[PDB]
Amino acid sequence: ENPAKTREYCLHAKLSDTKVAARCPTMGPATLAEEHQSGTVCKRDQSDR
Amino acid sequence: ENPAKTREYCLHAKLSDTKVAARCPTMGPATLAEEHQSGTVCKRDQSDRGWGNHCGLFGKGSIVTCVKASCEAKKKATGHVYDANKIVYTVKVEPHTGD
Amino acid sequence: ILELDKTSEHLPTAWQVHRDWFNDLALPWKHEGAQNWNNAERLVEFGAPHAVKMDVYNLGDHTGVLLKSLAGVPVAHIDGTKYHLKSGHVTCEVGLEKL
Amino acid sequence: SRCTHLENRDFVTTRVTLVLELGGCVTITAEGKPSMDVWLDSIYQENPAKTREYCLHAKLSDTKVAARCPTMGPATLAEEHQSGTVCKRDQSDRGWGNHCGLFGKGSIVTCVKASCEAKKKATGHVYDANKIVYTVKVEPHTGDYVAANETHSGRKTASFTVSSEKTILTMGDYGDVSLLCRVASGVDLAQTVILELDKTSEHLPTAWQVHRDWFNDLALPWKHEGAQNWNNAERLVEFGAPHAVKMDVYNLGDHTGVLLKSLAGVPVAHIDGTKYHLKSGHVTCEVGLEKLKMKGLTYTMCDKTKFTWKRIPTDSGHDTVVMEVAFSGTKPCRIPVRAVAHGSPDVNVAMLITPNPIIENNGGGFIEMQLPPGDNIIYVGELSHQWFQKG
Amino acid sequence: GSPDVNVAMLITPNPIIENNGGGFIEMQLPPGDNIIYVGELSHQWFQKG
Amino acid sequence: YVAANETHSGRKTASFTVSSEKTILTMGDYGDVSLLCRVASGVDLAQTV
Amino acid sequence: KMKGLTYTMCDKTKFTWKRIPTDSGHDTVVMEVAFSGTKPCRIPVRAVAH
Ligand SMILES: *[C@@H]1O[C@H](CO)[C@@H](O)[C@H](O)[C@H]1NC(C)=O
Ligand SMILES: *[C@@H]1O[C@H](CO)[C@@H](O)[C@H](O)[C@H]1NC(C)=O
Asked: Topology in the membrane (chain E)?
């Protein structure tokens, strides 16, 4: 009767509120407040400017 | 004049808001909202638990601790970098007179 | 140009330091206008877990660690906004033919 | 049982010799005597004797410079004699335009009054084998369970020192136990300094158990207790290269982090006001069970039908099973506890670490036992529980 | 010598006072100088050898 | 400086009998000092009249 | 405990010999100075080998 739940997995993500920030070739790292929040995925990358 | 600030370093941390959460050996990971806030340091580890450790089972329980960590006032080492398009060399000349 | 507290009465205003070595300083760091320190872990130790404790320890002021690694290093003067090298050189041609 | 609270434990079978350690516990057992949990609770001293103070951050003030032209002999200051000054004597390239009459190496001297900055001291203390106290604790291994943050009302304490003597503790109803701990067989205290910093630092250890020679070997400015000036104050001051009639004095900054970085692989030590505690150390101690008594051997067995589990049989993580039962009456009772293998169909194999388990009004429900490997059934009257034992 | 170790090897073991009794004590001691104590009573003792 | 016929204020006196242990003398502003003189290892009284 | 480690140095100009440096008969030198200020002080004593 009612065995204990271990890990849940997610099969299909729901994505909302995309944001972008960028900087010029010597202004160091671009940043967003959403890098320091729960429930966000972020990527940091380099772009030819 | 005013060469570009590069990376600042912090020489002395100001540590605050040490928060702990822990769980019994079956219940998986302990958690804090700190772990996701800005300006925190955290560690996750395993702590021995048992009966009387106010816990059901003898084993290792997940523990997480997080400390809020700003820089101490005026304890910064700032770097600056020169620009070949704004640097000035100064050359001086004097006539080798009898003065 | 490495710069600490400009108001330090018993230190150089700055030091002329190598770019790779500066990027190898083992401390928490951030860029100009960034709000919070990268690698804040570097100034915090966690004491081995005890039941529902893990011990947050501030690893102290690293200023003297830096100054030992800056012993004998070339100074740089800072005349307000002007950041001056105190070692280095330039190549010139001097025209004597109209003296 | 306090010895269930620790993952370091041992078991021993009328007098017995033990080694008792900080961060260790022994469940003593004997035929027809109640078992006892015994540990070294603390090693400490009230206000141990100071050794050397060190300064971690110098304070420099009243800088003075004097210089002399290339042949007028050595420059001098009265401050080169005075106590609590750091000085450097050097040569300066002088000439005309520095307003000498001549070109060559002048003499320059610079001196500064060099104290130590407020609370920036590392202080050593050392233990005395004739004033150090070893606290040993004992509790009767009754059928009562208390948390780590609870206290067996039967928990009893003995303090050992070179002047202390073979001590008898009355274990309440469980008779009495005789204890003789040889403090001279314990820690080699001469090899240790209790290194201390600012005690008030919220995010640091109160002290460190450093080696004796290492504390004498530190390259810092230093003094013995109550002296008003610092030996070797050069160790926090650099002097610049001289320029004409000037030389710069550089304060080498706070060495607190330099020391803390070097305190790697070093055991912490605890300070409780005036009490300075070690957190590693041990004593050879001799225990006697001759006057211990089992409670309630005259009681009836409790009614086998009237038990319930309060804590189902659970592995302690030692080789022992632990459990707690609740009985519906309030009767003083023996508990009918047994265990039988899935093998020999009726032979009892419950090797109790809690011998002669008994219930009393508001006590006695807890039991600890060792078992043989493979499947068993544990029984506590009409309570039963199958048990696979590891092997 | 040893500044606090008790060396009073009592021939009268567990000495006790009672109303109108118990004041007498006999002991063996190690050779050389000692101090005997009976509370705040003290007495230096050179033992023969 | 006081002459041999003159008393120094901080002169402090301890009278070692056989009934005597480590004795504390308060040296005014100079703190405390303590003495234990071992009277049975002084003069050989049995040989002396 | 040392008395007076905390006191200021006395004014170097205000000393006079009351008993000039004298050989004690032991290996030591003894002397006594009179100081004309009223102050509690440390004495700025030193000696220099040629
Ligand atoms: C012991 O600690 C536990 C921690 O969960 C707490 O629930 C319990 O009330 C404590 N007992 C007492 C009275 O200190
Ligand atoms: C000691 O003798 C001297 C003379 O030699 C005398 O002047 C002095 O009063 C005597 N007593 C004291 C207390 O100095």
From this structure: Multi-pass membrane protein
Give start and end residues of each alpha helix (H) in chain E. none
How many angstroms is the resolution?
A: 3.0
Please, do chains A and B touch (3+ CB pairs < 8 Å)?
A: yes
Q: What are the angstrom distances between the C-alpha of D164 and each of B49, C22, D167, D173, E20?
A: 37, 60, 8, 26, 30
Burial class (CB in 10 A: 0-12, 13-18, 19+), D129: middle
In the reported structure, the alpha carbon of residue G34 is separated from the centroid of ligand 2 by a whole-number distance in angstroms of 20
Best residue in D53, D225, D228, D230 to probe G by mutation, most G CBs within 10 Å? D228
Residue D22: CB atoms within 10 Å: 19
Instruction: Search chain B and give the residue with CA nearest C29.
Output: B9
Pairing of strands D26-30, D10-12: parallel
Task: Pull the structure tokens for residue D66.
Answer: 């004097």
Experimental approach taken: cryo-EM
- From atom 12 of ligand 2, which residue's Cα is the shortest distance away? F6
User: C-alpha distances in angstroms, F34 versus B59, D161, E34, E48, F12?
Assistant: 57, 23, 18, 28, 11
Tokens linked to D334? 């023996």
Alpha-carbon distance of C31 to D183, in angstroms, equals: 58
**C-beta of residue B22 within 8 angstroms of C-beta of residue C20:** no
In 3D space, the residue among D9, D4, D1, D39 whose CA is nearest the CA of residue D21 turns out to be D39
D181, D20 Cβ separation under 8 angstroms: yes
